[PDB]
Design an enzyme around this catalytic site. Structure first.
Site, short mmCIF file in Angstrom:
data_model
loop_
_atom_site.label_atom_id
_atom_site.label_comp_id
_atom_site.label_asym_id
_atom_site.label_seq_id
_atom_site.Cartn_x
_atom_site.Cartn_y
_atom_site.Cartn_z
N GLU A 120 0.80 -1.21 0.00
CA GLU A 120 0.00 0.00 0.00
C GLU A 120 0.84 1.26 0.00
O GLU A 120 0.38 2.30 -0.48
CB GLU A 120 -0.94 0.01 1.22
CG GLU A 120 -2.32 -0.61 0.99
CD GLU A 120 -2.37 -2.13 1.22
OE1 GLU A 120 -1.70 -2.60 2.18
OE2 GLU A 120 -3.07 -2.84 0.46
N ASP A 144 27.24 13.74 -29.03
CA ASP A 144 27.46 14.79 -30.00
C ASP A 144 28.80 15.40 -29.74
O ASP A 144 29.28 15.28 -28.59
CB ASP A 144 26.35 15.80 -29.84
CG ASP A 144 26.55 16.93 -30.79
OD1 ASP A 144 26.45 16.59 -32.18
OD2 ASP A 144 26.77 18.06 -30.41
C1 LIG Z 1 -1.80 -5.54 1.10
N1 LIG Z 1 -1.09 -6.17 2.22
C2 LIG Z 1 -1.79 -5.80 3.46
C3 LIG Z 1 -3.16 -6.48 3.59
C4 LIG Z 1 -4.40 -5.92 3.27
C5 LIG Z 1 -5.39 -6.85 3.55
C6 LIG Z 1 -6.86 -6.67 3.29
C7 LIG Z 1 -7.45 -7.52 2.35
C8 LIG Z 1 -8.78 -7.43 2.01
C9 LIG Z 1 -9.53 -6.44 2.63
C10 LIG Z 1 -8.95 -5.57 3.56
C11 LIG Z 1 -7.61 -5.67 3.90
F1 LIG Z 1 -7.09 -4.81 4.80
N2 LIG Z 1 -4.74 -7.92 4.00
S1 LIG Z 1 -5.46 -9.29 4.45
O1 LIG Z 1 -4.41 -10.22 4.77
O2 LIG Z 1 -6.14 -9.93 3.35
C12 LIG Z 1 -6.45 -9.01 5.72
C13 LIG Z 1 -5.94 -8.87 7.01
C14 LIG Z 1 -6.81 -8.62 8.09
C15 LIG Z 1 -8.17 -8.51 7.88
N3 LIG Z 1 -8.66 -8.65 6.64
C16 LIG Z 1 -7.84 -8.89 5.59
C17 LIG Z 1 -3.41 -7.76 4.07
#
Ligand SMILES: CNCc1cc(-c2ccccc2F)n(S(=O)(=O)c2cccnc2)c1
Ligand SMILES: CCCCCCCC/C=C\CCCCCCCC(=O)OC[C@H](COP(=O)(O)OCC[N+](C)(C)C)OC(=O)CCCCCCC/C=C/CCCCCCCC
Ligand SMILES: CCCCCCCC/C=C\CCCCCCCC(=O)OC[C@H](COP(=O)(O)OCC[N+](C)(C)C)OC(=O)CCCCCCC/C=C/CCCCCCCC
Ligand SMILES: CCCCCCCCCCCCOCCOCCOCCOCCOCCOCCOCCOCCO
Ligand SMILES: CCCCCCCCCCCCOCCOCCOCCOCCOCCOCCOCCOCCO
Ligand SMILES: *[C@@H]1O[C@H](CO)[C@@H](O)[C@H](O)[C@H]1NC(C)=O
Ligand SMILES: *[C@@H]1O[C@H](CO)[C@@H](O)[C@H](O)[C@H]1NC(C)=O
Ligand SMILES: *[C@@H]1O[C@H](CO)[C@@H](O)[C@H](O)[C@H]1NC(C)=O
EC number: 7.2.2.19
Lengths: 257, 977
Positions: B296, B338
């Site tokens: 992110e 050049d």
């Molecule tokens: C991008 N790397 C960081 C990241 C972002 C997410 C995530 C995925 C789907 C929706 C929202 C989210 F924050 N996750 S996650 O492991 O899927 C996860 C962890 C804890 C709760 N829900 C999902 C891991």
């Protein structure tokens, strides 16, 4: 040809090793841990209170039924039956008639199979709301019986002076009628102090929370009303904006006719 | 289609354009012709709107990966507000956060490109150019942009050639075509058609060029875009800007990420449905996993690092037009460069002399920072007298602060060179010249072909006259009869003529323009004060004079250029000259700057020394090679590749714009990453097709600068080497910053993988994963930009683009599934400790989620039989968040430290030596603590004030990371095998 094996076997080696390391962390953690008393009770500041029979709506506990339609309340009663099937003389043999009336401290393990003594609490102590002489726990009348149960926290002590009472009253008492009259069972509406303190499931495998019945008597029919049902004891707080079950239970109720 | 004009009769030209060849265009007719064809200038690049220049920043490899991510997030969130009453909406948060970094970054890129093109635009000295037009038979001055086709114009020395001009008549008119052709020497312009190709004729003068000396008149043939200038520029439209090596690399690891996200998401969708989940939720975790592999904050931090390197270069007067370019020079393997105006200064300056029977060597640098020559001798003092006195050039007024080599001069080409030479040897040449009153002077003509003048001397005790003269060396020699040498004035016997001729041909062989100087003091008897000299009667000697010496001039390298070439080659970068100039000059400068090393030779040199035909020369022996455009025309691409592969030090002379672009292409296709450096319009096309185009800020044409990705605001060619260094750091350092940023993504995901497949309470939340990705680890990961090098970086070959990538599969596999693994067992140990010490043993924790999250249980029983409400379980879940988060943070102090170095141990290079990194570890821990122990934080950001055992549970796992990477790095260090 045969080198993906020599690296993948490095990974299975690495994950087996790392797993074992984690295992020993668990094992060593599981000896930090006393089997009879939790190390910290950080979120169990005050006990939760639960009601029975519990029926839930979009906004929380929402009990609604029709005195003339047993379909809408048989279920409710049948939960109060199942709930109390473990307060029967039959399934109370592992506990003893505590009569002490004040805290039942035990420091040693003097009960069968290296355990502690838990008190008896039997359904018939809820008297009118015990499912006899009325197998509908007051619903078919319009004067229902709501069982209130205080959550058990180990070695938690509610108060030394009196026993904790259950005060149960209208949230907004209808402005053409009187306050909520309730009859409690036992009579002042109390949990007797010899049930405190709870030592844990290992310690008292046969323990059973004291119940108090609240028989609501003068609820107006065919009107939406909300009953607050809080617990009065010194060490028990019931004004927590982020847990509305700490020290109480609110429920909406409408009895239809 | 342009070719018609220089081959017409003056009758035909007057017909075509309804004009006179002497009285010019009518006034009204030129007013109408202006309405017809518009102003006489080049219409600027079309000019894209502001809002779209913002729009294009939101596009890119990482960016599109993030838009697909937020796409997936909103598809899933819709599925989930359809699937029962869930007010969870994590995917709302995550998707909107992704859009947020993509956009905010976008603003930052747009604003950087704004400020950079204001910095470039604000050194462009737009002052309206003028032109001597003749209309209705009147000579007057109009703005150049009001010249319509068919106008009669005049040029003299100094003037800028206003349009494309076909010459009707010219007196000794020479011109500076270096912006169009390569040629560094002045080009004759005469009215006679000498070629049918209008580039190579002498009867056209070109739109952008400079008239150096002489005078011409001619008719206007093209205005604006239609001129050879606007045509060569319009060629650079048909050149497409391929994408930079850094953009390629980013897209490579976006591909690796995408691979992983699919492979995982698929694997755990199979697993999810084999655990008896509904296909409709197994798709939701497929989606969550796929999105979970997309970092992110990455796009944010790299767009900060590139920006810091840009600031470094901008500090060194090296303004970059967009952030990707700060890398390119580091990846470059060849520099097509050049010659005139780029490597050289495009200024003819005195470089050598021949006097007292010796070739002396003047300091040709622009900052005057080299070896001058010996000025003891009487011969020199005389030769200085002649070249100072026999001269009509003069500095424009009020230039005393301007360094002499940069001063504007109202003179001819040779005369300007010599006037600066006297001002830098004698000091104040014009006053000196005043002290010896000129009484007679023949200027340069085509009869005599020499310039001479006679002067009364300085003091009154000598009342003689002194005659001084300069001209072509053979023509000066025959007209004189003695030679100044060492205080003698000896007879010019056969051997002095042979030695003079030897010196003349040697300076001609190094591609310099040789002039001979001479003097004669006139008797008081024959020529007494007040004597009337008459240039037509010639009543004075033009013969029997006394030779002083030879002075010779060249277009000489820029001061820092030879050293810059040296370092680029020290750093494995092939330098190629690609110059439009004539082979002999091209090869001279290619010697002087280090393109052709002292002692290498061409196949023509080998034949010439061995005395053999060039058919017999073994080409493998000739390390240098010069190829003009003509031979390059009759070459298969395979012959070009044979020549580039065979002859390390390559010089291309007489190379058209398109041929520069073709040499760039041939290298590129051979696998090179190519940088081109350029002065003007001719090199502009190469500049666009280049992996990085470098334009000279001052010397450079608007066409060049526009094509270029980077502008040397002060024409300091050594900036190039700084570009190599900063692009080799910022690459190695990005490989560090990424490795750090990617490693938190496995500990951020294994909780959710377990929370699904084991149904444990949720270890780590979305709301806190965002804090890690965008708050706590940002400043550490940017601090990695400041790492110094781990080697003698400027002695390393340029990276191999096909082998050494920003992110390999080994690098990812390591950071994800070994350092990320150790971080996940760290967090999970702190998780099971945090729960068991609060009431929930591990074996209970499997399967416990349905009850955990149930709002209809306010009396769920822990392992001691105590009864938690849902809210109380929730504050425990936040505690689980905060301990998994802190496990990740401790392990990311270990991460930032071991990722300081890829090879060296932390004990060697250090721990506290990167000071920005230390400030960032302090910052990371301070934000951590503020999120834990500030009041209100459990409710606003779901962070609990964790107890102080929970910090230490990860310490052994952190140190384990440190030790593990040390042992790996020492394995590589102390064992290359
Ligand atoms: C991008 N790397 C960081 C990241 C972002 C997410 C995530 C995925 C789907 C929706 C929202 C989210 F924050 N996750 S996650 O492991 O899927 C996860 C962890 C804890 C709760 N829900 C999902 C891991
Ligand atoms: C591809 C890589 C995959 C790696 C996955 C990890 C695999 C290894 C995990 C588990 C193996 C067993 C570990 C636990 C056993 C330890 C040894 C042992 O014998 O200890 C006894 C405990 C306690 O016994 P009790 O509670 O009945 O008595 C209470 C005891 N009194 C009364 C004294 C308090 O036994 C127990 O609790 C048993 C607990 C078993 C369940 C543990 C929870 C499972 C969670 C796993 C998450 C792992 C994260 C993986 C991260 C990978 C990153 C890539
Ligand atoms: C590198 C720079 C990148 C550029 C910055 C972009 C950052 C944008 C990131 C995320 C934006 C999405 C969040 C916006 C929505 C706010 C909604 C709101 O109304 O909020 C209230 C919530 C509290 O919800 P709850 O869980 O209690 O409800 C539980 C509800 N039930 C019980 C039903 C479950 O709180 C929240 O969601 C707020 C969660 C926000 C997480 C923030 C992550 C950290 C970002 C730090 C960047 C700081 C930049 C500062 C720049 C200064 C320059 C001068
Ligand atoms: C892998 C297993 C790890 C086990 C962790 C053991 C934690 C022991 C904590 C000891 C902390 C001291 O007791 C806490 C109470 O502090 C009182 C003072 O404040
Ligand atoms: C398998 C790896 C496990 C590694 C764990 C090793 C460390 C275990 C920690 C136990 C060490 C005993 O020392 C206890 C340290 O605690 C000291 C902190 O004291 C500060 C006071 O703490 C008060 C709690 O914080 C305030 C908020 O809570 C109320
Ligand atoms: C329980 O003990 C009490 C104490 O007084 C006694 O009165 C009562 O009979 C007992 N109940 C039984 C054994 O059912
Ligand atoms: C409880 O029920 C009995 C009848 O069996 C009656 O004597 C007593 O008044 C009842 N109490 C209330 C509050 O209804
Ligand atoms: C339930 O009460 C309603 C009044 O809301 C009444 O109309 C109805 O007859 C009762 N149910 C049955 C099955 O009679």
């Amino acid at each position: 040809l045969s080198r993906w094996v020599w690296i993948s076997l490095y990974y299975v080696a690495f994950y087996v090793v790392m797993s074992g390391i984690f295992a020993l962390c668990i094992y060593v953690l599981m000896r930090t841990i006393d089997p009879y008393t939790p190390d910290y009770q950080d979120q169990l500041k005050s006990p939760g209170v639960t009601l029975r029979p519990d029926v839930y709506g979009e906004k929380g506990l929402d009990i609604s039924y029709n005195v003339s339609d047993s379909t809408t309340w048989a279920g409710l009663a049948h939960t109060l039956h199942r709930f109390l099937a473990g307060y029967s003389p039959a399934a109370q043999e592992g506990s003893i008639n505590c009569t002490s009336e004040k805290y039942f401290f035990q420091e040693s393990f003097l009960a069968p199979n290296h355990t502690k003594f838990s008190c008896k609490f039997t359904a018939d102590m809820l008297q009118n709301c015990s499912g006899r002489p009325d197998p509908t726990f007051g619903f078919a009348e319009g004067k229902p019986c709501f069982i209130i149960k205080m959550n058990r926290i180990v070695k938690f002590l509610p108060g030394n002076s009196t026993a904790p009472r259950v005060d149960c009253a209208f949230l907004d008492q209808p402005r053409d009628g009187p306050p909520l009259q309730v009859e409690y069972f036992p009579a002042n509406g109390t949990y007797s102090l010899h049930y405190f303190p709870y030592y844990g499931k290992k310690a008292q495998p046969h323990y059973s929370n004291p119940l108090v019945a609240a028989k609501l008597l003068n609820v107006p029919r065919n009107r939406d009303v909300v009953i607050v049902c809080k617990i009065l004891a010194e060490h028990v707080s019931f004004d927590n904006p982020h847990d509305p079950y700490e020290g109480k239970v609110e429920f909406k109720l409408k009895i239809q006719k | 289609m342009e070719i018609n004009d220089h081959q017409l009769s003056v009758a035909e030209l007057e017909q075509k354009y309804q004009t006179s060849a002497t009285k010019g265009l009518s006034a009204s007719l030129a007013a109408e012709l202006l309405l017809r064809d518009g102003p006489n200038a080049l219409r600027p690049p079309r000019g894209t709107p502001e809002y779209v220049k913002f729009a294009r920043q939101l596009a890119g490899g990482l960016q599109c990966l993030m838009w697909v991510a937020a796409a997936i997030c909103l598809i899933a969130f819709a599925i989930q507000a359809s699937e029962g009453d869930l007010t969870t909406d994590d995917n709302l948060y995550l998707a909107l956060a992704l859009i947020a970094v993509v956009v905010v970054t976008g603003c930052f890129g747009y604003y950087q490109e704004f400020k950079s093109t204001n910095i470039i635009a604000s050194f462009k000295n737009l002052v309206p150019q003028q032109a001597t037009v003749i209309r209705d038979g009147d000579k007057f001055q109009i703005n150049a942009d009001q010249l319509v086709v068919g106008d009669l114009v005049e040029m003299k020395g100094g003037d800028r050639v206003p349009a494309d001009i076909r010459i009707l008549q010219a007196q000794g008119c020479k011109v500076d075509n270096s912006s169009l052709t390569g040629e560094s020497e002045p080009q004759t312009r005469s009215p006679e058609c000498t070629h049918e190709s209008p580039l190579e004729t002498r009867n056209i003068a070109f739109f952008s060029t400079m008239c150096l000396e002489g005078t011409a008149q001619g008719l206007v043939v093209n205005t604006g875009d239609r001129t050879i200038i606007g045509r060569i520029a319009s060629l650079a439209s048909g050149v497409e800007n391929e994408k930079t090596p850094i953009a390629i690399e980013i897209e490579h690891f976006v591909d690796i990420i995408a691979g992983l996200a699919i492979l995982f998401g698929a694997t755990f969708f199979i697993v999810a449905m084999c655990i008896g989940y509904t296909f409709l939720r197994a798709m939701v975790f497929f989606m969550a996993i796929v999105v979970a592999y997309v970092p992110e904050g990455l796009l944010a931090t790299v767009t900060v690092c590139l920006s810091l390197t840009a600031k470094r270069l901008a500090s060194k007067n090296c303004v970059v037009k967009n952030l990707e370019a700060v890398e390119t020079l580091g990846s470059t393997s060849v520099i097509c460069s050049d010659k005139t105006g780029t490597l050289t200064q495009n200024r003819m300056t005195v470089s050598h002399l021949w006097f007292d029977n010796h070739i002396h060597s003047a300091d040709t640098t622009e900052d005057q920072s080299g070896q001058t020559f010996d000025q003891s001798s009487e011969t020199w003092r005389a030769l200085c007298r002649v070249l100072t006195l026999c001269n009509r050039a003069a500095f424009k007024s009020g230039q005393d602060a301007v360094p002499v080599p940069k001063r504007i001069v109202i003179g001819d080409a040779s005369e300007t060179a010599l006037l600066k030479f006297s001002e830098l040897t004698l000091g104040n040449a014009m006053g000196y010249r005043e002290r010896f009153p000129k009484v007679c002077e023949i200027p340069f003509n085509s009869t005599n072909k020499f310039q001479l003048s006679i002067h009364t001397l300085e003091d009154p005790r000598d009342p003689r006259h002194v005659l001084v003269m300069k001209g072509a060396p053979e023509r000066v020699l025959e007209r004189c009869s003695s030679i100044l040498i060492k205080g003698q004035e000896l007879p010019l016997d056969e051997q002095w003529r042979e030695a003079f001729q030897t010196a003349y041909l040697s300076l001609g062989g190094l591609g310099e323009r040789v002039l001979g100087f001479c003097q004669l003091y006139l008797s008081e008897k024959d020529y007494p004060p007040g004597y009337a000299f008459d240039v037509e009667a010639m009543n004075f000697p033009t013969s029997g004079l006394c030779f002083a010496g030879l002075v010779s001039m060249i277009d000489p390298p820029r001061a820092t250029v030879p050293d810059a070439v040296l370092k680029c080659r020290t750093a494995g970068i092939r330098v190629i000259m690609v110059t439009g100039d004539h082979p002999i000059t091209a090869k001279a400068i290619a010697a002087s700057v280090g393109i052709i090393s002292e002692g290498s030779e061409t196949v023509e040199d080998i034949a010439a020394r061995l005395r053999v035909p060039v058919d017999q020369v073994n080409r493998k022996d000739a390390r240098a090679c010069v190829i003009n455009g003509m031979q390059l025309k009759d070459m298969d691409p395979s012959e070009l590749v044979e020549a580039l592969r065979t002859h390390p030090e390559m010089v291309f002379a007489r190379t058209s714009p398109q041929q520069k672009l073709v040499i760039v292409e041939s290298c590129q296709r051979l696998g090179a990453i190519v940088a081109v450096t350029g002065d003007g319009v001719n090199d502009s096309p190469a500049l666009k097709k280049a992996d990085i185009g470098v334009a000279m800020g001052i010397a450079g044409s608007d066409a060049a600068k526009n094509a270029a990705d980077m502008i040397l605001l002060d024409d300091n060619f050594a900036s190039i080497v700084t570009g190599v260094e900063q692009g080799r750091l910022i690459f190695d350092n990005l490989k560090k910053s990424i490795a750090y940023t990617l490693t938190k993504n496995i500990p951020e995901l294994t909780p959710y993988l377990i929370y699904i497949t084991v149904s444990v309470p949720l270890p780590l939340g979305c709301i806190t994963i965002l804090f890690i990705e965008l708050c706590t680890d940002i400043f550490p990961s940017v601090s990695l930009a400041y790492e110094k090098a781990e080697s003698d970086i400027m002695h390393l070959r340029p990276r191999n683009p096909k082998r050494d990538r920003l992110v390999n599969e080994p690098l990812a596999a390591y950071s994800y599934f070994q350092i990320g693994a150790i971080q996940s067992f760290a967090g999970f140990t702190d998780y099971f400790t945090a729960m068991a010490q609060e009431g929930w043993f591990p074996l209970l924790c499997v399967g416990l989620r349905p009850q955990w999250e149930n709002h209809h249980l306010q009396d769920l029983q822990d392992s001691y039989g105590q009864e938690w409400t849902f809210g109380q379980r929730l504050y425990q879940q936040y505690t689980c968040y905060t301990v998994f988060f802190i496990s990740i943070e401790m392990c990311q102090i270990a991460d930032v430290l071991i990722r300081k170095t890829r090879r060296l141990s932390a004990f060697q290079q250090g721990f506290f030596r990167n000071r920005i990194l230390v400030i960032a570890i302090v910052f990371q821990v301070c934000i951590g603590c503020f999120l834990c122990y500030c009041p209100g934080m459990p409710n606003i950001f779901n962070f609990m004030p964790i107890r102080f055992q929970w910090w230490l549970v990860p310490m052994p796992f952190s140190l384990l990371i440190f030790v593990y990477d040390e042992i790996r790095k020492l394995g590589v260090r102390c064992c290359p095998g």
